[PDB]
Scaffold this motif. Structure first.
Motif, mmCIF file in Angstrom:
data_model
loop_
_atom_site.group_PDB
_atom_site.id
_atom_site.type_symbol
_atom_site.label_atom_id
_atom_site.label_comp_id
_atom_site.label_asym_id
_atom_site.label_seq_id
_atom_site.Cartn_x
_atom_site.Cartn_y
_atom_site.Cartn_z
ATOM 1 N N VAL B 541 0.828 -1.202 0.000
ATOM 2 C CA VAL B 541 0.000 0.000 0.000
ATOM 3 C C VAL B 541 0.870 1.262 0.000
ATOM 4 O O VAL B 541 0.698 2.154 -0.826
ATOM 5 C CB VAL B 541 -0.996 -0.013 1.170
ATOM 6 N N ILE B 542 1.845 1.319 0.889
ATOM 7 C CA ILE B 542 2.634 2.554 1.046
ATOM 8 C C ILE B 542 3.428 2.832 -0.234
ATOM 9 O O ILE B 542 3.521 3.970 -0.693
ATOM 10 C CB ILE B 542 3.585 2.474 2.253
ATOM 11 N N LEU B 543 3.984 1.780 -0.814
ATOM 12 C CA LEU B 543 4.756 1.904 -2.034
ATOM 13 C C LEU B 543 3.877 2.413 -3.178
ATOM 14 O O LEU B 543 4.302 3.251 -3.972
ATOM 15 C CB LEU B 543 5.422 0.568 -2.383
ATOM 16 N N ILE B 587 11.011 2.659 8.089
ATOM 17 C CA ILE B 587 11.317 4.088 8.187
ATOM 18 C C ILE B 587 12.665 4.396 7.524
ATOM 19 O O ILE B 587 12.817 5.420 6.883
ATOM 20 C CB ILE B 587 11.305 4.592 9.649
ATOM 21 N N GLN B 588 13.605 3.459 7.615
ATOM 22 C CA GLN B 588 14.919 3.633 7.010
ATOM 23 C C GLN B 588 14.767 3.657 5.500
ATOM 24 O O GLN B 588 15.348 4.488 4.814
ATOM 25 C CB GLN B 588 15.845 2.497 7.439
ATOM 26 N N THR B 589 13.964 2.744 4.981
ATOM 27 C CA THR B 589 13.749 2.694 3.542
ATOM 28 C C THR B 589 13.078 3.961 3.017
ATOM 29 O O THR B 589 13.430 4.456 1.952
ATOM 30 C CB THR B 589 12.883 1.495 3.145
ATOM 31 N N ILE B 590 12.124 4.485 3.771
ATOM 32 C CA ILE B 590 11.420 5.704 3.378
ATOM 33 C C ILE B 590 12.391 6.890 3.344
ATOM 34 O O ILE B 590 12.458 7.636 2.365
ATOM 35 C CB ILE B 590 10.253 6.001 4.343
ATOM 36 N N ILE B 591 13.151 7.051 4.415
ATOM 37 C CA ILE B 591 14.080 8.169 4.498
ATOM 38 C C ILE B 591 15.095 8.149 3.340
ATOM 39 O O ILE B 591 15.314 9.179 2.717
ATOM 40 C CB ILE B 591 14.807 8.196 5.846
ATOM 41 N N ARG B 592 15.652 6.972 3.028
ATOM 42 C CA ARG B 592 16.644 6.837 1.953
ATOM 43 C C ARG B 592 16.128 7.329 0.611
ATOM 44 O O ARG B 592 16.857 7.946 -0.143
ATOM 45 C CB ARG B 592 17.175 5.386 1.832
ATOM 46 N N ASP B 593 14.867 7.068 0.304
ATOM 47 C CA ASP B 593 14.339 7.405 -1.008
ATOM 48 C C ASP B 593 13.553 8.684 -1.023
ATOM 49 O O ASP B 593 12.924 9.001 -2.026
ATOM 50 C CB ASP B 593 13.459 6.278 -1.531
ATOM 51 N N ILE B 594 13.609 9.436 0.066
ATOM 52 C CA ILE B 594 12.757 10.612 0.215
ATOM 53 C C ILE B 594 12.872 11.626 -0.944
ATOM 54 O O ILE B 594 11.875 12.219 -1.374
ATOM 55 C CB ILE B 594 13.021 11.269 1.584
ATOM 56 N N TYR B 610 7.190 14.825 5.400
ATOM 57 C CA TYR B 610 8.206 14.914 6.444
ATOM 58 C C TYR B 610 7.541 14.841 7.793
ATOM 59 O O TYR B 610 8.052 14.170 8.689
ATOM 60 C CB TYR B 610 9.040 16.210 6.332
ATOM 61 N N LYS B 611 6.392 15.498 7.934
ATOM 62 C CA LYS B 611 5.615 15.384 9.180
ATOM 63 C C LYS B 611 5.243 13.931 9.497
ATOM 64 O O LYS B 611 5.327 13.486 10.646
ATOM 65 C CB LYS B 611 4.357 16.256 9.153
ATOM 66 N N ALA B 612 4.883 13.188 8.471
ATOM 67 C CA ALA B 612 4.517 11.796 8.665
ATOM 68 C C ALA B 612 5.721 11.006 9.165
ATOM 69 O O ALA B 612 5.605 10.179 10.075
ATOM 70 C CB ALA B 612 3.952 11.193 7.373
#
Ligand SMILES: Nc1nc2c(ncn2[C@@H]2O[C@H](COP(=O)(O)OP(=O)(O)NP(=O)(O)O)[C@@H](O)[C@H]2O)c(=O)[nH]1
Ligand SMILES: *[C@H](Cc1nnco1)n1cnc(-c2cc(C(F)(F)F)cc(C(F)(F)F)c2)n1
Ligand SMILES: [Cl-]
Ligand SMILES: [Cl-]
Ligand SMILES: [Cl-]
Ligand SMILES: [Cl-]
Ligand SMILES: [Cl-]
Ligand SMILES: [Mg+2]
Lengths: 208, 1017, 123
Positions: B541-543, B587-594, B610-612
């Motif tokens: 879903v998130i992807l 969270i690590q995966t999200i931050i890396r591809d931000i 970023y708030k999320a």
């Protein structure tokens, strides 16, 4: 054919601002209290032809009340206005309605809760029930954001023309003329323009 | 022009001229109508204008002139009646009475001048309010007698009684003193036996005439207050519920009477009465079924056709059925012989609930809520309504309004576009619908699933496919989240998602995909429980939402962002831990591809993202790991920041660049966003930028001032300066946001506050008015709120820098600098609450400005200012009282006590501050009680103004009597003395005190008010 | 309606203001779709703009070759210009207009299209 529409409600609820928006498209930020009544013709174009309202925009401040219920004589419709950010204005709706229907016994009436653009709303949605037993139409509106601004007139038009499927339609757009500027006025235009350029447009943080 | 002649009272009134002016006003237009209107208002307002009323009523050929004549009389009767000589009162009564008799006896006039007759009736009623029954005891007996002599008179008497009942019982609270209202109510009550007898007789001996309608209209009013026995011990229910339901002329009013009957106060232990209550309902439903329409009739179509009075009739039927059943349906639920009545009544409501009319739907939905809430709790009831509830599921599911979350809508061209604005007026409706549907799902979870799943199947097969159908269904499915078991939810949501994915594949083109996208996003966001249990699917879903952040459809994109944060708010724990079969917390995966994920988003969408992330990061409670995550999240903005700080510091030139100003603003906004969700945890990031940030605040401030200097005030309107001020505002917002959530207040005080004050206060103080940011005041309020008690010199510094200069901006009118105005009084309030000492250190001149400031506040109509104005004043009085008998307290009272009393009385009595009545009254009560309880140590009077040793109570009364005497010179001394006696006595009972104040507000509006009214108890 | 005989060259959402020289303030005249319409018979390009919901005309004038778009001091997403003959309210009348858009991109695209329309009209 045209219909007399009386507009009533507490001072400061946005009656005149509402009408002006419909007359010229403008939003007036200043509160200049209406003195007695101001009458403005207002035309709408519909699939059943043009309908004209003679809008009697009355004073809501007691001190400026003028003829008061005298204005309502022979009204064929009405809008009762309150301000959703001021509870006292909703509390007075039954008083306005009383004075109105004593003079105009069987007319269509819209109740409007104005200023819904304001964040801190005081008269909750759920609280607005006065219209039910009195058979008034109700709309949340904002003269400022134009939220539902056409609704009161569209409903009244439908009730007065007696056609529930009536819709506003696009007025015919005549070919506009070709005019060349007057050589004699070009110096003045330069000036009038520069004042306009150097007066800031209002509400530059709005979406449009 | 000629029209102004009527305004010269030295001459006799030319009635012809009057009629021409009135006609010019009512039937004219333009400048002429306007002139006429001004003339008439001046005429009306002439205080001898009433003396011409008889002349006008006698000679005019224009009914509007007579109407206006009667308005002039009304004003006189309501305000100055008791000023008049007694013979003028008799005369006025006589010609109002005579005119009514006269107009009723001429059949043509009675037929065609109903407006004028109604007005005359009301005017009479105004005279009754003054004169009856004490100086008119025979009014009701004679009205009753006259009623038999003539049909017209009898009918008009009904109008008069209706109006009297309204004025006495429905509209007396705001317009009369408590005593006078009691007097008139008791008077009406005492003679109602005979009034009712006439009413009943008329109703027996007639069918559907105007006399009958008039009588029933009066009955509607009576029902607000009459004892129930008049309704249940006569035959009147049978008449209302049978006879008067049959003719349409009487049906409308009768139904409204029956609705009010259903609200009568009625004994609960009496089987006879119960049977009567059942019977009238039975009768009523029978008349509807046989004379109006059967239960199967299509009320949706009827309402839509809008013939005659059908819409109002259908509305009133809804009101009748819902009022009666909410009160009495239990009467119908146990007896088998009443079951059909119960269900038919409900079937009518089911049909009424299908009407397209929002406000009517809300009325019916309120009833359904009442019903299903009862069925949810009350043993053995839900089976009775199983078939009704089953139809109700369909109605609700098919009329689901668009949730707040769904940001796509169809335009007039049939294109699916992002909404221009929020549909703010359907928020409550959605909640109401959801509430009912949740209850209905609990009542039969099998029926609800079956209905939804098969409706869904008819979308896939194509048979019932439309945007409207897939939408309402999807919204309905999302809305019932929480009602099913986890197991049934699992299978349910799985089936729903499969079907919606299939629709997405099958329905091609941009509009279709947007619709279905919006729908799946709404559904999945509504079921976090499912997501929490199904990590692989959550990840997917998130992807997908990330894919949607690259969508060119802006509605979809925006909703992807809202849906991401909505899911994160509920499922964040699953992002912060390392899931089985994954190499890292997500969270690590999200931050890396931000950078990639957010590349196509607008700034505010990036900030939401970023708030999320901050929400998730704050789930990590190991501080080292959390700070590391924070650091990683802020990597892009911190690198952008670092490069900007190096440029800026080398030379204030580059900051003139509007591209750089935007970049900076978005860095600070990103920080604000993360601070909002991280709160106390944000501190390390704040520390990384704090000193350079405040230096930037200074540099931008210098630029703003330079630009105003070089360009004039008009500079503040320019994009460059607005951009520069945005930086300042966002900085202020960041510090406010952090301080409002901080848990280490020692660091706030020791590290943050001194540089903040140093950077912001003087800059505010020393800019021209138009360049001052109201947000400085807002930031300071939060500073004072959170740590004010720890920084007394800091608070003093705040006052010095903003108090006088802000006051001088806002004390010339009530409208300029509206934000400064609002934030100003919020700051003074919290300072007065938390750091009162700051006000004690003020020099006397400045403290006087403070008192002026507070009184200024309560003269606002703007509620934000007024309310704080009144609270500050109250809190100040308390703060002074707390000091006890010391020189500052004594000087406060000597200097300011009467200023607060008089200023409070002023806003209480001017009619322009009615919104603040409650708090005005509370302050006044506090002030009066201070003297009443001898809490003021020194005398409030001075020297030999009054005898030595005179108590402050005596002097207070003396002051107030004198103040009121001069301010309201039309009151008698006795009215004033009685009012103050009552008020002072009642200074410990707020409700009574407020009633006495309200009585006073009624009496100042007229002459001759009865002083004994203030004895009411 | 009177627009079937025209081609839509450009459409964009906008807010139109008119300058009240007496009050010395800008006043909104309408928000909605501003359209550039070319008459298929005369090849003459006009601005036609209507208010949302009421569909009332808030601008109706030829895009004259002699008009020039000027910045407003308050905005990087608006143009101001003098119009000698607008018939939105009926009788031909002169106005100073300001038109504002949702973005600078939109404002810049408008100017480009406006000037193109001016050259068409020059023919
Ligand atoms: N925020 C907001 N303000 C509004 C709205 N409508 C009107 N106002 C503001 O409210 C104030 C009063 O408006 P006005 O039209 O004079 O109210 P009124 O009911 O005619 N007053 P009166 O009865 O005394 O003539 C004005 O400052 C106006 O700009 C609205 O929808 N939103
Ligand atoms: C249809 C909507 C659409 N718009 N553009 C492309 O498609 N569609 C196709 N797939 C989805 C969708 C799938 C998932 C998944 F695969 F993760 F379950 C999730 C979503 C959502 F919205 F993110 F939950 C949508 N929608
Ligand atoms: Cl309020
Ligand atoms: Cl009349
Ligand atoms: Cl009885
Ligand atoms: Cl969680
Ligand atoms: Cl006296
Ligand atoms: Mg007004």
């Amino acid at each position: 054919v045209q219909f007399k529409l009386v507009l009533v409600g507490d001072g400061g609820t946005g009656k005149t601002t509402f009408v002006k928006r419909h007359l010229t498209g403008e939003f007036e930020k200043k509160y200049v209290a209406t003195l007695g009544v101001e009458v403005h013709p207002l035309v709408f174009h519909t699939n059943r032809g043009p309908i004209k309202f003679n809008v009697w925009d009355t004073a809501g401040q007691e001190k400026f009340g003028g003829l008061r219920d005298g204005y309502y004589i022979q009204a064929q419709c009405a809008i009762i206005m309150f301000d959703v950010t001021s509870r006292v204005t909703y509390k007075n709706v039954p008083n306005w309605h009383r004075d109105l229907v004593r003079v105009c016994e069987n007319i269509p009436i819209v109740l409007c809760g104005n200023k819904v653009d304001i964040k801190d709303r005081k008269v909750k949605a759920k609280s607005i029930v006065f219209h039910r037993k009195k058979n008034l139409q109700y709309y949340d509106i904002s003269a400022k954001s134009n939220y539902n601004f056409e609704k009161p007139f569209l409903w009244l038009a439908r009730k007065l023309i007696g056609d529930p499927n009536l819709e506003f339609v696009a007025m015919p757009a005549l070919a506009p003329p070709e005019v060349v500027m007057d050589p004699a006025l070009a110096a003045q235009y330069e000036h009038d323009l520069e004042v306009a350029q150097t007066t800031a447009l209002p509400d530059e943080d709005d979406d449009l | 022009g000629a029209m102004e002649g009527i305004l010269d009272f030295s001459n006799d009134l030319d009635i012809a001229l009057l009629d021409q002016v009135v006609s010019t006003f009512y039937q004219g237009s333009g400048v002429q109508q306007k002139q006429a209107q001004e003339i008439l208002t001046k005429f009306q307002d002439n205080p001898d204008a009433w003396q011409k009323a008889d002349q006008i009523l006698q000679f005019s050929t224009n009914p509007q002139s007579k109407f206006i004549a009667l308005s002039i009389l009304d004003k006189l009767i309501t305000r100055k009646w008791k000023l008049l000589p007694n013979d003028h009162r008799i005369g006025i009564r006589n010609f109002v009475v005579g005119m009514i008799i006269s107009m009723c006896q001429d059949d043509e006039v009675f037929k065609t001048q109903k407006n004028l007759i109604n007005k005359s009736d009301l005017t009479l009623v105004q005279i009754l309010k003054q004169e009856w029954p004490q100086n008119w005891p025979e009014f009701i007996p004679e009205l009753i007698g006259s009623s038999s002599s003539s049909v017209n008179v009898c009918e008009n008497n009904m109008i008069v009684l209706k109006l009297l009942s309204e004025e006495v019982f429905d509209f007396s609270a705001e317009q009369m003193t408590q005593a006078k209202a009691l007097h008139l109510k008791n008077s009406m009550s005492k003679e109602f036996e005979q009034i009712f007898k006439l009413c009943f007789q008329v109703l027996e001996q007639g069918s559907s005439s105007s006399l009958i309608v008039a009588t029933l209209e009066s009955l509607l009013r009576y029902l607000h207050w009459i004892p129930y026995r008049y309704i249940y011990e006569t035959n009147i229910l049978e008449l209302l519920s049978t006879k008067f339901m049959t003719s349409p002329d009487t049906r409308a009013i009768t139904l409204k009477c029956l609705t009010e009957v259903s609200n009568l106060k009625i004994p609960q232990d009496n089987d006879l009465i119960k049977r009567q209550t059942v019977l009238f309902f039975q009768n009523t439903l029978q008349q509807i079924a046989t004379s109006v329409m059967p239960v199967t009739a299509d009320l949706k179509a009827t309402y839509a056709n809008a013939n005659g009075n059908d819409q109002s009739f259908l509305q009133d039927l809804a009101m009748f059925l819902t009022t009666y059943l909410a009160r009495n349906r239990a009467l119908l639920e146990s007896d088998e012989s009443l079951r059909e009545l119960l269900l038919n009544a409900h079937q009518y409501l089911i049909q009424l609930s299908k009407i397209e009319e929002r406000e009517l739907f809300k009325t019916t939905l309120d009833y359904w809520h009442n019903l299903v809430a009862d069925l949810f709790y009350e043993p053995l009831k839900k089976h009775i309504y199983e078939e009704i509830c089953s139809q109700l599921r369909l109605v609700i599911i098919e009329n689901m309004v668009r949730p707040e979350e769904v940001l796509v809508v169809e335009n007039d061209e049939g294109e699916i576009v992002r909404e221009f604005v929020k549909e703010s007026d359907t928020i409550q409706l959605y909640k109401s619908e959801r509430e009912v549907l949740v209850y209905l799902t609990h009542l039969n979870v099998i029926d609800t699933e079956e209905i939804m799943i098969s409706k869904l199947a008819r979308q896939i097969d194509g048979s019932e496919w439309s945007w409207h159908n897939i939408n309402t269904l999807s919204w309905a499915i999302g809305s019932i989240s929480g009602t099913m078991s986890e197991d049934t939810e699992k299978r349910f949501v799985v089936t729903v998602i499969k079907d919606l994915l299939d629709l997405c594949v099958k329905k091609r083109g941009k509009d279709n995909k947007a619709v279905v996208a919006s729908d799946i996003m709404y559904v999945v966001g509504q079921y976090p429980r499912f997501l929490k249990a199904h990590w692989n699917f959550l990840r997917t879903v998130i992807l997908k939402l990330f894919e949607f952040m690259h969508e060119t459809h802006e509605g979809v994109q925006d909703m992807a962002c809202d849906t991401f944060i909505k899911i994160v708010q509920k499922c964040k724990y699953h992002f912060v831990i390392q899931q089985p079969r994954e190499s890292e917390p997500f969270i690590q995966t999200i931050i890396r591809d931000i950078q990639k994920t957010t590349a196509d988003l607008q700034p505010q969408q990036v900030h939401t993202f970023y708030k999320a992330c901050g929400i998730i990061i704050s789930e990590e409670r190991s501080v080292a790991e959390r700070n590391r995550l924070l650091s990683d999240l802020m990597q892009l903005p911190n690198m952008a920041w670092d490069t900007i700080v190096e440029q800026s510091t080398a030379n204030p030139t580059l900051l003139l660049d509007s591209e750089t100003v935007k970049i900076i603003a978005n860095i600070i906004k990103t920080n604000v966003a993360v601070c909002t969700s991280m709160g106390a945890d944000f501190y390390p990031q704040l520390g990384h930028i704090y000193y350079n940030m405040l230096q930037l605040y200074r540099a931008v401030s210098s630029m703003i001032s330079a630009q105003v200097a070089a360009e004039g005030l008009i500079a503040t309107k320019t994009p460059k300066v607005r951009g520069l001020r945005t930086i300042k505002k966002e900085i202020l917002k960041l510090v406010e946001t952090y301080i409002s959530k901080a848990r280490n207040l020692d660091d706030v005080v020791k590290v943050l506050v001194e540089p903040l004050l140093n950077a912001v206060l003087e800059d505010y103080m020393n800019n021209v008015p138009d360049a001052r940011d109201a947000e400085v005041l807002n930031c300071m309020t939060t500073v004072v709120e959170k740590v004010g008690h720890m920084i007394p010199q800091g608070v003093i510094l705040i006052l010095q820098s903003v108090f006088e200069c802000t006051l001088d901006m806002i004390n010339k009118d009530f409208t300029e600098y509206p934000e400064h105005r609002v934030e100003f009084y919020k700051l003074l309030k919290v300072i007065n609450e938390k750091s009162f000492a700051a006000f004690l250190e003020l020099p006397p001149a400045a403290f006087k400005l403070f008192v002026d400031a507070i009184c200024w506040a309560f003269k606002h109509n703007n509620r934000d200012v007024e309310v704080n104005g009144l609270q500050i004043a109250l809190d100040l009085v308390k703060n002074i009282e707390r000091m006890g008998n010391v020189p500052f307290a004594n000087e406060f009272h000597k200097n300011y006590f009467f200023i607060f009393v008089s200023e409070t009385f002023f806003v209480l009595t001017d009619s322009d501050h009615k919104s603040g009545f409650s708090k005005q009254a509370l302050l006044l009560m506090k002030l009066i009680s201070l003297v009443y309880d001898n809490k003021i140590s020194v005398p409030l009077y001075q020297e030999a103004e009054v005898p030595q040793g005179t108590s402050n109570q005596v002097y207070l009364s003396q002051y107030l009597a004198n103040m009121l005497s001069n301010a309201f010179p039309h009151l008698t001394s006795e009215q004033i003395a009685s009012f103050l006696s009552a008020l002072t006595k009642q200074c410990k009972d707020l409700v009574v005190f407020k009633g006495t104040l309200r009585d006073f507000l009624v009496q100042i509006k007229e002459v001759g008010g009865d002083p004994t009214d203030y004895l009411f108890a | 309606t009177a627009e079937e005989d025209e081609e839509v060259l450009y459409k964009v959402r906008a807010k139109l203001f008119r300058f009240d020289k007496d009050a010395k303030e800008w006043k909104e005249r309408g928000t909605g779709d501003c359209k550039f319409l070319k008459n298929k018979k005369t090849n003459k390009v006009r601005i036609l703009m209507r208010r949302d919901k009421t569909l009332k005309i808030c601008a109706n004038h030829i895009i004259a070759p002699e008009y020039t778009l000027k910045p407003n001091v308050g905005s990087d997403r608006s143009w101001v210009y003098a119009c000698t003959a607008d018939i939105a309210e009926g009788e031909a009348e002169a106005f100073t207009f300001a038109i504002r858009f949702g973005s600078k991109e939109n404002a810049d695209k408008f100017k480009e299209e406006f000037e193109k329309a001016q050259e068409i009209n020059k023919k």
